[PDB]
Antibody
Framework: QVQLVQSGAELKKPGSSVKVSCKAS????????INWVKQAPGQGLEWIGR????????HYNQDFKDKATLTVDKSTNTAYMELSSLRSEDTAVYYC??????????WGQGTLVTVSSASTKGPSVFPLAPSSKSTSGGTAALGCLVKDYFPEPVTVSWNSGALTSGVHTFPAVLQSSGLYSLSSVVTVPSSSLGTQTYICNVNHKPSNTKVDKKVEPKSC | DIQMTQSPSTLSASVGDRVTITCKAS??????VSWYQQKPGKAPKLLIY???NRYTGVPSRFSGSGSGTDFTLTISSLQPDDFATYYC?????????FGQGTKVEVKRTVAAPSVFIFPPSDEQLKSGTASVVCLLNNFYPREAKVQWKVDNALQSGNSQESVTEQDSKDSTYSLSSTLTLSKADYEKHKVYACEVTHQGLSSPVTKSFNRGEC
């Protein structure tokens, strides 16, 4: 069957350029156009342009005329898209998609391009300690704040994977510093607070930073 | 050029419901309209092409109709695998364009959040910054408002929040909000409050602590 296989995620500084690839399998490459589509985070789909692998005939969305360059190497069944003069607004997942008839059946898996002037940094992990008294019963919340890292992602587990029920790990927010911050919490029986240990296991692979933070009562 | 306007933006529905999503083109597109399904982290998947044709493999519960400027996608009986975002798109003229999407999420009974507030750790305070966190746990629907107050002053512009995807077991949402102040500012005030407004709460819930302990 048909597969479109795109290149991996890119992290780029503003002003730079990037070239993203889309390798096609399972059909005659020169028999269909390759289309490119942008999906900025939390947003919809924007069509960039298309290219005919047979001869390189290319058509662009004019909003991308000074941004994107589409090429193809028919000899390796691959289409490329180059983005120039990268800025923050170019941060998106970019998809290629095979186009024969006026619809897009076969899509690549997407390539995330993130544009940022930030540099790699492992997180500080701070405790969200379960309160002295409060709630509306016999459940307490605790957690870890995973602060000031770059880039995404970060993983969090609790008790080495032994604790999953009640766990919520939130989407990171991007701070004005250029660094991310994320929280992970868990709700547990308040009677468990004195006897059961709770450790959040944080791994930020890009900075090679792993931390195990034991979280316990001690605010007041 | 041709704008595609989808409605509703969000649709709440139950397994077994008949669901209809609407898409309006700003110019005539004949029947060159397609519908796509997208789930988080995944590429869009084609459901319907040519306004009304089911793509190969697509279950029969999916259909579409319309011509000219008005189009619909219908799911005749909603299944657990169908909660996702749906996009329409026109391929009548270049540039091809798409609607802004309709998220179909799971309807359930309204549930108020449990709210928890967390002071900044001493460990963090040593670095010159304070992060105060407010958790709103397991609520429905998604719409919720956090108001941070510091010695009764409403704080604005110095917080960020995020929301989990709908829970696969109980269909609720959770939200985490962080208020960030300098250590110097943190130590100038006493009462830190997170005030939560939600349609499940008859009146706002406030959780607070006084800096210093108790």
């Amino acid at each position: 069957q048909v597969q479109l296989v795109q290149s991996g995620a890119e992290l780029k500084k503003p002003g730079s350029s990037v070239k993203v690839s889309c390798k096609a399998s399972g059909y005659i490459f020169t028999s269909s156009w390759i289309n490119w589509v942008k999906q900025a985070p939390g947003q919809g789909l924007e069509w960039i342009g298309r290219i005919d692998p047979s001869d390189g005939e290319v058509h662009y969305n004019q909003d991308f005329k000074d941004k994107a360059t589409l090429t193809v190497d028919k000899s390796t069944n691959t289409a490329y898209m180059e983005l120039s003069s990268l800025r923050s607004e170019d941060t998106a997942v970019y998809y290629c998609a095979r186009g024969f008839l006026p619809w897009f059946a076969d899509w690549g898996q997407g390539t995330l391009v993130t544009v940022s002037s930030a540099s790699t940094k492992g997180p500080s992990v701070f405790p969200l300690a379960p309160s002295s008294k409060s709630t509306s019963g016999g459940t307490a919340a605790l957690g870890c704040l995973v602060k000031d890292y770059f880039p995404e992602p970060v993983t969090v587990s609790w008790n080495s994977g032994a604790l999953t029920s009640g766990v919520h790990t939130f989407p990171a927010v991007l701070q004005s510093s250029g660094l991310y911050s994320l929280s992970s919490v868990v709700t547990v029986p308040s009677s468990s607070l004195g006897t059961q240990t709770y450790i959040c296991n944080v791994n930020h692979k890009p900075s090679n930073t792993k931390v195990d933070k034991k979280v316990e009562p001690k605010s007041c | 050029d041709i704008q595609m306007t989808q409605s509703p933006s969000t649709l709440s529905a139950s397994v077994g419901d008949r669901v209809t999503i609407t898409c309006k083109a700003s110019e005539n597109v004949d029947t060159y309209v397609s519908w796509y399904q997208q789930k988080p982290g995944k590429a869009p998947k084609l459901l319907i092409y040519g306004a009304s044709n089911r793509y190969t493999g697509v279950p029969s519960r999916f259909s579409g109709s319309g011509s000219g400027t008005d189009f619909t996608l219908t799911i005749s009986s909603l299944q657990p695998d169908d909660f996702a975002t749906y996009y329409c798109g026109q391929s009548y003229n270049y540039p091809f364009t798409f609607g802004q999407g309709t998220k179909v999420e799971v309807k359930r009974t309204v549930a108020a959040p449990s709210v928890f507030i967390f002071p900044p750790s001493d460990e963090q305070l040593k670095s010159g910054t304070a992060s105060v966190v407010c958790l709103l746990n397991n609520f429905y629907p998604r719409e919720a408002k956090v108001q941070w107050k510091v010695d009764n002053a409403l704080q604005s512009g110095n917080s960020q929040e995020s929301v989990t995807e709908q829970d696969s077991k109980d269909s609720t949402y959770s939200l985490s909000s962080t208020l960030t102040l300098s250590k110097a500012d943190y130590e100038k005030h006493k009462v830190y409050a997170c005030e939560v407004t939600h349609q499940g709460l008859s009146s706002p819930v406030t959780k607070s602590f006084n800096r210093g302990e108790c």
